[PDB]
């Protein structure tokens, strides 16, 4: 029974990590937008 509770907690913390990673990904587009102007002819 304790194994099921551990699995549920692990799934919850994995979902929390996935949400944190999704929040991290947001700033990548803003970071990359500035580089576009650098090199054109």
């Amino acid at each position: 029974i304790d194994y099921n509770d551990y699995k549920i907690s692990k799934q919850s913390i994995f979902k929390d990590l996935e949400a944190l990673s999704f929040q991290i990904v947001e700033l990548e587009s803003n970071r990359d937008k500035l580089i576009k102007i650098s090199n054109t002819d």
């Binding site: 304790d2 692990k10 990590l17 944190l20 991290i24 970071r31 500035l34 054109t40 002819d41």
Partner: protein, 76 residues
Amino acid sequence: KSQEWPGKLEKMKSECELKEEEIKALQSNISELHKILRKKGISTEQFELQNQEREKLTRELDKINIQSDKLTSSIK
């Protein structure tokens, strides 16, 4: 494995804290890129519009060159 579950959870929460700390770091990269854009200008108005025309004329030139080579071999 039962004794390792709280330790694994604590290490996982430490990793989450590390990710939260990493969240704040991207502002430094954004500021550095802003400084670079202050150092370097350049602008773009009609690159994409004429790129398609350049590609079309390049394909036409390639076809003409292939035809010229084929006709030269046939002539010989």
